[PDB]
Amino acid sequence: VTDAYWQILFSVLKVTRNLKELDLSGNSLSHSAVKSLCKTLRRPRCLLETLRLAGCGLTAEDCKDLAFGLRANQTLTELDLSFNVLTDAGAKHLCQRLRQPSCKLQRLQLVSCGLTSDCCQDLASVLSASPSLKELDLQQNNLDDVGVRLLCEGLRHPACKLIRLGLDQTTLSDEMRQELRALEQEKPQLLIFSRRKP
Ligand code: NA
């Protein structure tokens, strides 16, 4: 799918009304496509509350353009970036924006994005300073005890507001698992799920 097409597609979006959910999952988005989309997100009338970019071929550099295009947006509440090789570098660009008080995302999914323990400090930073984040899906990533313990510091922060955290506990030490279960009692309304655990 060619750049000229994308360019015209995102121009059609700016002039259609009460379009509140954009779902491009499955479409490979070139870097030209990703920059165009950053423009439709930076028009002040962007009525978009849900943006789904799962399995689109996004890379770390696309996260920079994405976080930049959302600096002046306070309407978007769902973002799906699952199934893109974003790496901890991509996740870092995103966190710098999610951590802003101006950003009020509620649901973020980063399922299967190639994240490791390296990004958990930037994630915990979001956890302990986000005014509206209620759902963070980190399933199907390679987080170990190093990373999860940094997440727990963000979870225990009295400002943290998460109610659902998708997190695979497959390779965590039993010490780690116990820390996670103790946190069910310090934060009674946080649910820690995993479709990968029976
Ligand atoms: Na925030």
Curated annotation (Swiss-Prot):
Phosphorylated by MAP3K20 isoform ZAKalpha, MAPK11 and MAPK14 in response to UV-B irradiation and ribosome collisions, promoting activation of the NLRP1 inflammasome and pyroptosis. Induction: Up-regulated by ATF4 during endoplasmic reticulum (ER) stress response. Up-regulated in arterial endothelial cells exposed to plasma from patients with peripheral arterial disease, but not to plasma from healthy controls. It comes from the Eukaryota. LRR repeats lie at residues 18-39, 47-67, 75-96, 104-124, 132-153, 159-182. It is found in: Cytoplasm, Cytosol; Cytoplasm; Nucleus. Belongs to the NLRP family. Interacts (via LRR repeats) with BCL2 and BCL2L1 (via the loop between motifs BH4 and BH3); these interactions reduce NLRP1 inflammasome-induced CASP1 activation and IL1B release, possibly by impairing NLRP1 interaction with PYCARD. Interacts with NOD2; this interaction is enhanced in the presence of muramyl dipeptide (MDP) and increases IL1B release. Interacts with EIF2AK2/PKR; this interaction requires EIF2AK2 activity, is accompanied by EIF2AK2 autophosphorylation and promotes inflammasome assembly in response to danger-associated signals. (Microbial infection) Interacts with vaccinia virus protein F1. Acts as the sensor component of the NLRP1 inflammasome, which mediates inflammasome activation in response to various pathogen-associated signals, leading to subsequent pyroptosis. Inflammasomes are supramolecular complexes that assemble in the cytosol in response to pathogens and other damage-associated signals and play critical roles in innate immunity and inflammation. The CARD domain, rather than the pyrin domain, is involved in the interaction with PYCARD, CASP1 and CASP5. The ZAKalpha motifs are recognized and phosphorylated by isoform ZAKalpha of MAP3K20. In macrophages and dendritic cells, NLRP1 inflammasome activation of CASP1 and IL1B maturation can be dampened by direct contact with activated effector and memory T-cells. This effect may be mediated by hexameric TNF ligands, such as CD40LG. This is NACHT, LRR and PYD domains-containing protein 1. It comes from Homo sapiens (Human). The lineage of its organism: Eukaryota, Metazoa, Chordata, Craniata, Vertebrata. The gene is NLRP1. The chain holds residues 792 to 989 of 1473 of the full protein.
